[PDB]
Design a protein around this ligand. Structure first.
Ligand SMILES: [Mg+2]
Ligand SMILES: [Zn+2]
Ligand SMILES: [Zn+2]
Lengths: 517, 1160
């Protein structure tokens, strides 16, 4: 209605395309650099019909749209923060406990420790690892002995779990273990999904029957032969997959022997581990989502220094994302300041490198800033400009080091810079090419080849070849007096004699003479 | 069994979308680091924007580290660093790519007038398509319940609908969401169902969007491009050399902005990749994705939305698109200040010694080494660097018959660049022949011209056979001579006539040449008397040859001696009996038409020599007593001021209308100005008394100034009238006229007041000149852009129809005849004769045979003539239908370049056009060519019927006229405003006037006829040149109007889809191939459509040609969408590619290659 009627009725056709008119007769926040092109595109060119393509199409900013989703405060208090942090520690604990349940994680740690000793107190390592190994070898015996039907044996197992929970592993180690268990589980469900895909679809066995049958042992062939001997219509098809199912069961039993665990519970421990992961991850996400304000607030001070606002607040977000990981609620120190440092370090360790086109090390950046901070006083504490010699004198560095330092400053200048203000000038247009050779020079080089190729013609074979091979021309790889003296019997001095005699021959011709210059 | 896999000759180029794998095909590696050059070693980093392994090595043949150096390993890569050691130009041609994490929308295919990604998907651009991919409002990707297929949801709506159903209508948000949208879209099935739905019971209430989108979808699906490529997942990288960072002077590197862009996008992309592996907060990751979008869009094309800044410069960064959206320097060239060279011929120019020495450097080298002297090439260099006498003689050998073409700054027409034979001159200025000094519009105020050296053999022959001055005798615009003698020489030959009575006269008779001896030996004067001599004339007829004719005519000394210059033929004597004025050019013209090129050329040199010499002998000057004022000046001034005094007194006592007494008193001073002007001229014209024999007689003043005026030589009535008479009515900044004209004149003193009044005229004069000078070229550009593609081809077609040519007669009420507009024109068919026979069918009206059109009396003033307006040609112009008008006397050679020469000739005299029911001037010309509707368009009767009122103001309304007869009615709309011209009941014809006002060219073409509308345009555009007094042939106007009527509109039913407005090119060629193909009913009838220069030029086949003038960002985009290909016949697009031009010396090449591209 408003926009359409005004635009159409007015522009008929506004003669000189009066742009500075209807752009004020539009709503929303003005002075944008976005809506402009959408008006200079419709008026002319595809006239008449374009004015009908405009309304039908008419029927914004990164930061402003970022503050929008950040608007969802969900702010916290000391109670809230400690709560979330508590959930984090709870999740982490359940995960680590789930790792303790895994015996192969313990035995692998044992194996890799023996690898460590086979090449942080060395005796302390030999101490704790001895404790772990001791509890393991005592718990291991209480397994096949079956004394105390996994009641008190379970107590020794859980005590072994506690012993394992005493070890403070490295992030790479924990991740490797967890990933190993998930890959193991990947093979487990690989075999299970294999058996199911083969028996259910290929053999036309209903999913009800497969869940009723397979869920039992899942390893022994007691369920498979009982599925075949059920005399069902889908039992006769199982014969065409007997070897496949057998292979899957044999491999799953192999996994049972690998983990040394009950196959009907590995899903349980892996499940709880997954539960812990999701919980801790969720809680940590809530943390970083909550302290989102701190990032932008402190990032505001670092603005305008070779990196835009979004990039800064982004490095601050990842800085905060790192701060949340290393923190506990059982600490007198709050999160508001501890996170602040990690954020400052995060963005300052980004502005340091990824700012200028050319590389630069941190010490360089610090030295440069220090030089600036010092220089701003010499011209203010005296009255005249700061001389480079005196400015270098007030520092530990000599002077030439500072000279070379200033040759690294600035982006620097871009080619698209206007200069003479012609029609229209560009700095990069005055930059001459030097890697190319003059056509004159190339012509002289070609004529040089011809000249030499014609000069070695007035020579003998045992002299042309000598000069040619010695100074290496028209044969790539040049040889020495020995490699030429061997292929011509007489060695060294003889070939050098001839080599000089040819040069003696070149004292009258003028061709190469003028080609010299 | 060809199928070659090398870089051979190409017949066409193709443009289309690029698949991610298509990008990988160009990828010689992947940029992974924002690093450019080392901070210390200044050496290319590993996988940065300037890698050596990916792109190319720094030095020519040595690798990065230095394990391999010379040409030993030019095919093998290095062991320590995989750097292919070839050239350094490799670094200029190597591509490379970046593979982004989450998908990114291409800024062009996103927001470029019509949303290509939107219109293809049928979805709002900056409204919905923005909010759904900027992570705000989730969109659906096809649902089989409750939700449609492309609706927009909020997070709340998302979870609500997900709770209601879910796990069976999953639809993401953002870039990859739009990707799944375009990917899921079935172009084929939609192309069918859309055709089904958008045709069922719908009038003109829907057909618009229907036909539009269906044509668009059919185009895209047939293009071959998959909509998946619309938003890219792999972004290619520009070669390093095309965006280098080269160290300037003493450090301070110089880089391109693209490095900043690529560095930013790389950084943001890497952070995104890192965040998609670490903790993944939805707000953080989605924000970084939007930031990646920002970086990518900023790199591809800034435009457009705020403009990414940085780089310390407060100015934006030059993105890729900005480097290809919107002067060809050349070697073997130079320039210098020009100077007159009287001793030269017409085919020669003064080229400075040192200048020509440096120019023909390589030629001097070759010739030196060829003869001897220089033992080698470098010897020649050292030999010319040390200018050693003999080298100059060698130079005299190399420039012998090696043409050099000269050029002036403002190149309006073809005669801007003309070739000459280089003549070495001891000096540092470039000398020019004073005859061709007018074609350049060049003066010697200090103007400077440039010189070019035709290097190629055929380039030298092109300059000699085409651009040589001796071949450019006649102007391409009008058949009249262009190298015609100017001021100095004409005043000379004017002085070589001018019969003065007695004064060492008497009729002492002799025989031509002997008179020369008489003149040098004094005794007799020169301008007497008259005197008689024996003239041996030469004429030819029928069987050509030559026929002598000795007689005794009464000429003068000047005419006698001047007769020696006149060539063999010509009517003789009578051409000299006149004087020197305009016949000075007429004589040259007739000489050319009855003799030929050479005789005319040598005649031109001779008349130039003669004019200069005798002008110098005359010694005409300009003393203060040369501009004599009239004695009646003060009288007339007093009388005029008396009359105006009475009028002012009358105004004082009421009586006369004081409101407009201003106008009538202006008429008083205007009359007085004409009185002083007439008095001054009648005085300064005749005067004198002499004393013939018995004394007492009168001739015409020998008053220098008058001699200059009565013989061209820059001296007009108005200027002289201001010199001795008076400067008339002066303009006022208001636009009004001052009621106190400059009574005084330049011969007299000028008061401070009236000078401060005249300063306005001078100011607005110079200012207006500065405007129309640029405005003229501004029009020329549009003319060329629309016309520079048609060239005379297919020899001479058939057809007879063509506009009936008739003398432009304003003589209806003002008397003004012009009947030379038919000459060198090819006749339609035997245009009758008051009796029988006469004119043949295709006989081109000769220059002597148009003079035969006067032997058929004043009765025959109408002849049908073939024109470029008609001509049943396809993609060119019939040689016959065109004409012949060139510097050449014959018809245009097959494969010329009619378009550009036409445009040039039209926009050349634009410099002398005064901008403003009569607009008049250059603006009038522009409006006529643009075919714009007037501010008060008249109305015509579409079908002949009976005029009657259709409900007196019953709408709406506003009157209504309804001419109904025979069958079916029509209801035109009259808006009360403006009256009428036909009462009720009266009958009208097909296209009668019923508004008596300005006519609209659209209505004329649509109803009256093509011959009528073209006749209108030419006869209306000429009328604005009549007033300005600029001669220009109608052929060129007809030429631009030809392709001004390029496209039409079909209205019926054929293989072409109705509503589509297409050019009569494809139309005619397809209707000719349908009447005898299967059935004439599978095709419709078209209708010519009038469209302006800009609207016509806007449409063109090649996308490169379009990418030249019109908005590149648009044309390149839309041409990218539909798999288009230029192949490849246009001039402009074949110019920027740098190949042979499909015209002139080319054409033959294009024809051979064109037929060659018929095998496959
Ligand atoms: Mg000048
Ligand atoms: Zn190497
Ligand atoms: Zn024709």
């Amino acid at each position: 209605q408003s926009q359409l009627k005004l635009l159409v009725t007015r522009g008929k056709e506004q003669g000189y395309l009066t742009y500075a008119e209807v752009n004020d007769h539009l709503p929303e926040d003005i002075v944008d650099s976005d809506q402009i092109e959408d008006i200079i595109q419709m008026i002319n060119d595809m006239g008449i019909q374009v004015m009908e393509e405009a309304p039908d199409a008419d029927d914004t900013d990164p930061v402003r749209m970022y503050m929008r989703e950040m608007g969802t405060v969900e702010l916290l208090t000391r109670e809230g923060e400690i709560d979330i942090a508590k959930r984090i520690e709870d999740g982490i604990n359940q995960v680590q406990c789930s790792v303790a349940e895994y015996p192969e994680a313990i035995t692998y740690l044992l194996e890799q420790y023996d690898r460590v000793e086979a090449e942080i107190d060395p005796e302390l390592a030999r101490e704790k690892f001895a404790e772990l190994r001791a509890q393991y070898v005592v718990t291991r015996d209480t397994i096949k002995a079956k004394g105390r039907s996994h009641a008190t044996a379970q107590e020794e197992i859980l005590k072994l779990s506690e012993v394992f929970k005493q070890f403070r592993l490295v992030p790479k180690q924990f991740d490797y273990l967890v990933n190993s268990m998930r890959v193991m589980m990947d093979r487990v469900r690989t075999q299970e999904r294999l058996i199911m895909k083969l028996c259910v679809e290929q053999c036309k066995m209903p999913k009800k029957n497969f869940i009723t049958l397979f869920t039992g042992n899942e390893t022994s062939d007691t369920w498979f032969n009982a599925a075949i001997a059920m005399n069902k219509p889908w039992s006769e098809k199982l014969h065409d997959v007997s070897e496949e199912v057998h292979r899957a069961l044999q491999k799953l039993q192999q996994i049972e022997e690998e983990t040394g665990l009950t196959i009907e519970q590995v899903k349980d421990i892996n499940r709880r581990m997954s539960i812990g992961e999701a919980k801790a991850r969720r809680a940590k996400k809530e943390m970083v989502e909550a302290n989102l304000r701190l990032v932008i607030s402190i990032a505001k001070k670092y603005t305008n220094r070779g990196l835009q606002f979004l990039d800064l607040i982004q490095e601050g977000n990842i800085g905060l994302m790192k701060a949340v990981d290393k923190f506990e609620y059982r600490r007198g120190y709050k999160f508001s300041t501890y996170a602040t440092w990690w954020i400052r370090q995060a963005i300052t360790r980004s502005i340091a490198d990824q700012a200028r086109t050319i590389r630069i090390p941190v010490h360089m950046i610090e030295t440069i800033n220090k030089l600036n901070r010092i220089s701003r006083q010499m011209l203010q504490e005296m009255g005249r400009e700061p001389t480079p010699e005196e400015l270098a004198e007030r520092m530990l560095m000599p002077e030439d080091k500072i000279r070379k330092v200033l040759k690294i400053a600035k982006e620097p200048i871009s080619m698209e810079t206007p200069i003479g203000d012609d029609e229209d000038s560009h700095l990069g247009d005055f930059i001459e090419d030097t890697t190319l050779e003059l056509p004159l020079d190339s012509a002289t080089t070609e004529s040089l080849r011809a000249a030499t190729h014609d000069v070695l013609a007035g020579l003998t074979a045992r002299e042309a070849k000598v000069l040619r091979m010695r100074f290496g021309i028209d044969m790539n790889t040049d040889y020495t007096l020995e490699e030429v003296g061997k292929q011509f019997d007489v060695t060294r001095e003889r070939i050098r004699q001839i080599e000089a005699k040819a040069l003696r021959k070149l004292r009258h011709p003028s061709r190469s003479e003028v080609l010299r210059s | 069994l060809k199928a070659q896999t090398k870089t051979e000759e190409f017949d066409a180029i193709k443009i289309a979308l690029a698949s991610p794998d298509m990008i990988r095909s160009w990828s010689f590696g992947e940029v992974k680091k924002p690093e450019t050059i080392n901070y210390r070693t200044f050496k290319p980093e590993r996988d940065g924007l300037f890698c050596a392994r990916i792109f190319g090595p720094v030095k020519d043949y040595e690798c990065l580290c230095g394990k391999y150096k010379r040409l030993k390993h030019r095919g093998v890569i290095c062991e320590k660093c995989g750097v292919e050691v070839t050239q350094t130009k490799v670094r200029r041609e190597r591509m490379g790519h970046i593979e982004l994490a989450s998908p990114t929308a291409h800024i062009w295919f996103l927001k470029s007038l019509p949303s290509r990604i939107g219109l293809l998907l049928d979805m709002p651009l900056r409204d919905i398509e923005r909010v759904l991919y900027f992570e705000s409002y989730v969109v659906i990707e096809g649902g089989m319940t409750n939700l449609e297929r492309q609706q927009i949801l909020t997070e709340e709506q998302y979870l609500d609908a997900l709770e209601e159903f879910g796990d069976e209508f999953d639809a993401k948000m953002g870039a990859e969401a739009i990707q799944a949208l375009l990917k899921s879209m079935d172009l084929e099935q939609e192309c069918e169902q859309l055709r089904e739905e958008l045709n069922e019971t719908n009038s003109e209430t829907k057909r618009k969007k229907l036909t539009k989108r269906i044509k668009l979808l059919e185009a895209f699906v047939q293009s071959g491009n998959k909509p998946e490529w619309m938003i890219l997942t792999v972004l290619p990288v520009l070669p390093p050399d095309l965006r280098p960072l080269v160290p300037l002077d003493g450090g301070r590197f110089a880089t391109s902005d693209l490095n900043d862009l690529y560095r930013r996008v790389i950084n943001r992309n890497n952070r995104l990749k890192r965040l998609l592996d670490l903790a993944a907060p939805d707000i953080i990751v989605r924000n970084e994705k939007r930031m990646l979008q920002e970086a990518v869009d900023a790199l591809l094309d800034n435009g457009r939305r705020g403009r990414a800044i940085t780089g310390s410069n407060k100015r934006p960064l030059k993105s890729l698109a900005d480097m290809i959206k919107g002067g060809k320097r050349v070697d073997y060239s130079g320039r210098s200040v020009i100077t007159v060279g009287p001793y030269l011929r017409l085919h020669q120019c003064g080229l400075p010694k040192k200048m020509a020495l440096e120019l023909f450097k390589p030629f001097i080298y070759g010739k030196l080494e060829l003869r001897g002297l220089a033992t080698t090439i470098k010897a020649a260099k050292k030999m010319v660097e040390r200018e050693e006498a003999v080298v100059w003689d060698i130079l005299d050998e190399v420039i012998r018959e090696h043409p050099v073409l000269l050029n002036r700054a403002p190149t309006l027409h073809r005669l801007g660049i003309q070739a000459f034979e280089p003549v070495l001159i001891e000096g540092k200025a470039i000398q020019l022949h004073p005859l061709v000094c007018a074609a350049y519009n060049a003066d010697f105020d200090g103007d400077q011209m440039a010189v070019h050296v035709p290097l190629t053999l055929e380039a030298q022959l092109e300059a000699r056979a085409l651009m040589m001055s001796t071949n450019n005798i006649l102007s391409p615009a009008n058949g009249e001579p262009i190298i015609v003698p100017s001021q100095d020489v004409v005043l000379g030959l004017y002085y070589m006539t001018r019969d003065c009575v007695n004064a060492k006269g008497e009729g002492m008779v002799l025989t031509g040449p002997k008179e020369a001896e008489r003149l040098y030996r004094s005794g007799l004067a020169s301008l007497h008397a008259r005197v008689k001599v024996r003239i041996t004339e030469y004429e030819k007829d029928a069987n050509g040859e030559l026929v002598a004719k000795t007689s005794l005519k009464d000429t003068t000394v000047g005419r006698a001696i001047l007769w020696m210059i006149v060539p063999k033929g010509l009517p003789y004597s009578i051409v000299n009996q006149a004087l020197g004025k305009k016949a000075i050019s007429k004589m040259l013209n007739t000489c050319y038409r009855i003799l030929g090129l050479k005789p005319t050329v040598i005649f031109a040199d001779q008349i130039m020599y003669t004019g200069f010499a005798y002008a110098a002998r005359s010694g005409a000057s300009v003393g203060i007593d040369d501009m004599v004022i009239p004695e009646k000046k003060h009288e007339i001034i007093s009388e005029a001021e008396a009359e105006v005094a009475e009028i002012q007194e009358q105004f004082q006592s009421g009586l006369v209308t004081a409101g407009e007494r201003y106008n009538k008193v202006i008429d008083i001073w205007a009359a007085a100005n004409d009185r002083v002007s007439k008095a001054m001229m009648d005085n300064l014209q005749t005067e004198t008394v002499i004393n013939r024999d018995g004394q007492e007689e009168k001739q015409v003043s020998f008053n220098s100034i008058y001699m200059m005026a009565d013989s061209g030589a820059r001296g007009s009535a108005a200027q002289i009238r201001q010199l001795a008479g008076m400067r008339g009515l002066m303009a006022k900044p208001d636009g009004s006229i001052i009621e106190t004209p400059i009574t005084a004149n330049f011969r007299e003193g000028l008061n401070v007041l009236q000078y401060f009044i005249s300063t306005h005229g001078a100011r607005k004069g110079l200012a207006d000149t500065a405007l129309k000078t640029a405005n003229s070229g501004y029009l020329t550009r549009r003319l060329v852009d629309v016309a520079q593609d048609l060239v005379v081809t297919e020899d001479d077609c058939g057809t007879h129809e063509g506009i009936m040519m008739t003398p432009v007669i304003e003589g209806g009420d003002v008397k003004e005849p012009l009947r030379d507009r038919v000459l060198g024109r090819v006749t339609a068919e035997d245009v009758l004769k008051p009796g029988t026979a006469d004119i043949l069918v295709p006989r081109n009206t000769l220059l002597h045979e148009q003079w035969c059109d006067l032997l058929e009396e004043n009765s025959v003033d109408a002849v049908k003539v073939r024109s470029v307006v008609s001509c049943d040609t396809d993609f060119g112009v019939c040689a016959h239908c065109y004409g012949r008008d060139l510097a050449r006397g014959h018809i245009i050679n097959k494969g010329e370049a009619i378009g550009v020469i036409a445009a040039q000739s039209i926009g050349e005299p634009g410099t002398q056009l005064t901008m403003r029911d009569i607009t008049g001037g250059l603006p009038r010309v522009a409006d006529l060519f643009e075919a714009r509707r007037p501010k008060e368009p008249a109305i015509l009767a579409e079908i002949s019927g009976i005029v009657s009122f259709g409900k007196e103001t019953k709408g709406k309304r506003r009157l209504v006229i309804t001419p109904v007869d025979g069958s079916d009615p029509y209801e035109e709309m009259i808006p009360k405003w403006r009256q009428l011209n036909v009462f009720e009941g009266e009958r009208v014809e097909r296209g009668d006037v019923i508004s008596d006002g300005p006519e609209a060219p659209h209505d004329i073409l649509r109803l009256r006829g093509v011959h009528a509308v073209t006749r209108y345009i030419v006869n209306e555009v000429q009328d604005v040149y009549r007033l300005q007094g600029v001669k220009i042939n109608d052929k060129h106007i007809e030429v631009i109007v030809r392709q001004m009527l390029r496209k039409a509109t079909i209205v019926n039913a054929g293989s072409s889809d109705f509503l589509e407005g297409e050019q009569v090119e494809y139309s005619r060629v397809k209707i000719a191939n349908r009447e005898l193909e299967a059935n004439g009913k599978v095709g419709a009838t078209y209708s010519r459509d009038l469209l302006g220069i800009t609207k016509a030029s806007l449409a063109t086949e090649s996308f490169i040609s379009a990418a030249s003038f019109q908005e590149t960002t648009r044309v390149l985009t839309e041409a990218a969408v539909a798999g288009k290909r230029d192949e490849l016949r246009g001039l402009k697009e074949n110019v920027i590619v740098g190949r042979l031009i499909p015209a002139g010396t080319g054409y033959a090449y294009h024809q051979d290659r064109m037929r060659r591209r018929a095998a496959g």
